[PDB]
């Protein structure tokens, strides 16, 4: 009747009710709650500060701006990934440190429901919380769903490699949002003692990063990485970040005399100017010319990450929470290459062209030139059919970006004594772009529709697709509840232990063993030549 009003640490918020078919209790939704001070002016390239408190009742019933980003690419990704019947257009702003809350709890009664905090993907460059409607997951599984934003691109990841601009601002924003959830979620019927972080692609990489960061201690109790981990190398910069910083500075019209001079100049630029610079840098496509070894992202900054992910894994001081790590069958099948304008159009590929392409693909796969013939031969050499070569080439890219890093992370996590689970998702959603070939199954992002209940929001899902979403949401929420996805009515999902059991999720969901085992061996041996 009366819209719901909730006390938070910094003031009161007003949300709205939305009913979902099948559920008598409306879900209370609060959109655009700030969890930090807007990072404007001198606060650019600094850690997020607490939000300033507000008087009276803040109206939390409209979607916030998305963090500044290429609007064309951001809109396109939102349209492709949204679980909503209609994509919600968003404004851009630097003032973007907001989260959205979907709580199925009757807030007039006592509730301490599991909380699931969603970290969106988009390469650390694009993306928005508001793409993901929490309504269906929250109602079907009785969990509080929180979708967060974090600074993107230059704003989120500009690093001088030193104390004048350490980097990882967007990850610090993710931490700040988690701190806010600890301090406030009980007011929305959530249990701050049961917080599950989950995310896809760059969001899954962020989750994996958080598992490795001391700054995230006591902020979550389970984790889920979907199609991205901290060994997804395209997102993690090792070695010297100064040349990139200088390139950004120069492109923005700034001198490079010192790091502090660069950062000061960049802090005087307008949002418009930094977006112009962003677009000039071409951050989500491959460089046409010159050395492939010459992207923005996560760095080893000394505050969030003290050493490389590989070193932190070997040390097992990371957070040994229950962790679910998964991939999709064909991660490089359609969506990623299409969004990147990846330079492969023909539908066939000879081996010479494959080798040159894999070198030009260095930013994505990080494969040294001397290793390229041996890698290309492994995947493509067994067949003289150039169509088949092309499909195997897409498998090559997927395995290096996603499957191999995911299994290495899951193995290290298990070996530290943490409960670990894996999956491979193999289904082609009806919600796919009708420009995607009918034969691409388990593309990057295809699991999103199941996790977020798209069959309950969008039109056209088959009986099988409806049931697949129910099953997936239930596994995810059981994992949030118990650190173990299993429950009555659901296929058995083995623990990822020394037998390396994992779940093959799709139309016929069943357990299997030793996901990507032969691929991990191949690549690990190759990279150690
Ligand atoms: C809250 O915001 C909506 C627009 O998003 C507006 O229509 C509504 O009247 C507002 N309610 C207030 C300020 O009480």
Q: How far is CA 528 from the centre of its chain?
A: 28
Tokens of 152: 């993107």
Ligand 1 atom 9 nearest Cα: 59
Is the Cβ atom of 61 under 6 angstroms away from ligand 1?
yes
Give the number of C-alpha atoms closer than 13 A to the C-alpha of residue 379, restricted to the C-beta side. Answer: 30
**Helical axes 242-251 vs 259-268, angle rounded to 10°:** 40
Q: Where are the beta strands (DSSP E) in 23-123?
A: 27-34, 57-59, 66-67, 92-93, 98-103, 113-119
> CATH number, domain at 5?
3.40.50.1820
What is the longest distance spanned by two Cα atoms in the chain?
Answer: 71
d(CA 279, CA 275): 6
- The angle, 0 to 180 degrees and rounded to 10, between the axes of the packed helices 351-360 and 386-398 is 20
Which residue bears the tokens 């999103």? 448
What's the rounded Cα separation, in Å, for the pair 409 and 397? Answer: 18
Can you tell me whether residue 494 is helix, strand or coil? coil
Q: Among 174, 172, 167, which Cα is nearest to 149's?
A: 174
Judge if the beta carbon of residue 62 lies within 6 A of ligand 1: yes
- Size (the chain), residues: 529
- Which regions of 301-449 does DSSP assign to beta strands (E)? 323-328, 420-426
Residue 424 pairs with which residues in a beta bridge?
A: 327, 504
Strand order of the β-sheet with 5-8 is 5-8, 11-14, 57-59
Inter-axis angle of helices 404-415 and 517-527, nearest 10: 100
Contact 436, 443 (CB under 8 A): yes
Ligand 1 contact via 256 beta carbon (within 6 Å): no
Measuring CA to CA, which residue among 174, 298, 171 is closest to residue 241? 298
CA angle 302, 303, 309 (to 5 degrees): 65
Q: How far apart are CA 461 and CA 452, in angstroms?
A: 14
Cβ of 16 closer than 6 Å to ligand 1, yes or no, is no
Report which ligand 1 atom has the smallest distance to the Cα of 62.
5
- Between 372-380 and 386-398, two packed helices, what is the crossing angle to 10 degrees? 120
Shortest-distance atom of ligand 1 to CA 61: 5
Question: What are the two backbone dihedrals, phi and then psi, of residue 470, each rounded to the nearest 5 degrees?
Answer: -55, -45
Angle, helix 372-380 to helix 351-360, in steps of 10 degrees: 130
Rounded Cα distance between 173 and 165, Å, is 15
Tokens 């969008």 belong to 458
At residue 304, the 3 state secondary structure works out as: coil
- What DSSP letter does each residue of 187-203 carry, written as one string? GGTEEEEEEEEEEETHH
Resolution of the experimental model in angstroms, please?
1.5
Structural domain range at position 41: 1-529
Ligand 1 in reach of 12 Cβ (< 6 A) = no
Contact 460, 483 (CB under 8 A): no
Q: How many helices (H) and strands (E) does the chain have?
A: 18, 18
- Asked if residues 513 and 501 have their Cβ atoms less than 8 Å apart, the reply is yes
Distance 29 CA to ligand 1 centre (A): 14
The residue to mutate among 59, 98, 130, having the most atoms of ligand 1 within 8 angstroms of its beta carbon, is 59
Structure tokens at 190: 């959530």
Ligand 1: residue whose CA is nearest its atom 7? 61
Q: Please give the tally of structural domains in the chain.
A: 1
Closest to 330 in 3D by CA, of 409, 421, 392, 410 = 392
The candidate with the shortest Cα–Cα distance to 437, out of 509, 387, 473, 363, is 387
Distance (Å, rounded) from C-alpha 473 to C-alpha 104? 15
* Radius of gyration, alpha carbons of the chain: 22
What is the CB neighbour count within 10 angstroms for residue 410? Answer: 25
Q: Measured between alpha carbons, how far is residue 51 from residues 33, 68, 285, 420, 423 in Å?
A: 10, 19, 35, 36, 38
Beta bridge partners of 98: 34
């Amino acid at each position: 009747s009366s819209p719901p009003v909730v006390d938070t640490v910094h003031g009161k918020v007003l949300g709205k009710f939305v009913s979902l078919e099948g559920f008598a209790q409306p879900v209370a939704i609060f959109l655009g709650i700030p969890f930090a001070k807007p990072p404007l002016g001198p606060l650019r390239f600094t850690p997020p500060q607490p939000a300033e408190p507000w008087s009276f009742v803040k109206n939390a019933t409209s979607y916030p701006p998305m963090c500044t980003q290429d609007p064309k690419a951001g809109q396109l990704l939102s349209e492709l990934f949204t679980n909503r019947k209609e994509n919600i257009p968003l404004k851009l702003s630097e003032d973007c440190l907001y989260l959205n809350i979907y709580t199925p709890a009757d807030l007039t009664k006592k509730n301490r429901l599991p909380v699931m905090v969603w970290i969106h993907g988009g390469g650390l460059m694009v993306g928005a919380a508001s793409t993901y409607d929490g309504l269906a997951l929250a109602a079907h599984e009785n969990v509080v769903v929180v979708t967060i934003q974090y600074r993107l691109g230059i704003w989120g990841f500009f690093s001088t490699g030193d104390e004048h601009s350490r980097g990882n601002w967007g990850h610090l924003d993710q931490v700040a949002a988690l701190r806010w959830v600890q301090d406030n979620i009980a007011s929305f019927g959530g249990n701050p003692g049961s917080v599950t972080i989950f995310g896809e692609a760059a969001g899954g990489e962020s989750v994996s990063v958080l598992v490795l960061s001391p700054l995230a201690k006591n902020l979550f109790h389970r984790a889920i990485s979907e199609s991205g981990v901290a060994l997804t190398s395209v997102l993690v910069k090792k070695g010297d970040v100064k040349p990139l910083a200088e390139q950004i500075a120069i492109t923005a019209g700034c001198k490079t005399t010192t790091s502090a001079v660069m950062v000061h100049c960049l802090r005087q630029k307008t949002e418009e100017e930094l977006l112009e610079t962003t677009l000039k840098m071409k951050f989500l496509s491959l460089d046409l010319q010159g050395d492939p070894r010459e992207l923005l992202g996560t760095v080893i900054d000394g505050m969030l990450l003290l050493k490389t992910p590989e070193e932190l894994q070997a040390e097992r001081n990371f957070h040994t929470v229950p962790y679910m790590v998964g991939i999709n069958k064909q991660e490089f099948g359609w969506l990623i290459p299409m969004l990147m304008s990846y330079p492969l159009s023909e539908g066939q590929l000879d081996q010479k062209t494959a080798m040159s392409l894999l070198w030009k693909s260095y930013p994505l796969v990080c494969i040294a030139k001397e290793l390229i013939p041996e890698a290309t031969e492994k995947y493509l050499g067994g067949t003289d059919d150039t169509v088949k070569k092309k499909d195997l080439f897409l498998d090559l890219i997927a395995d290096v970006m996603f499957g191999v890093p995911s299994v290495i992370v899951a193995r290290n996590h298990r070996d530290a004594g943490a409960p670990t689970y894996m999956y491979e998702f193999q289904y082609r959603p009806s919600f796919s772009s009708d420009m995607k070939p009918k034969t691409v199954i388990g593309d990057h992002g295809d699991e999103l529709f199941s996790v977020f209940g798209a069959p309950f929001l969008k039109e056209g899902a088959s009986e099988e697709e409806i049931r697949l979403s129910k099953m997936v949401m239930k596994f995810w929420a059981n994992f949030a509840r118990n650190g173990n996805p299993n429950g009555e009515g659901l296929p058995h999902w083995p623990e990822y232990n020394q037998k390396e059991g994992y779940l093959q999720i799709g139309a016929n969901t069943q357990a299997a063993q030793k996901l990507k085992d032969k691929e991990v061996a191949f690549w690990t041996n190759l990279f150690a030549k």
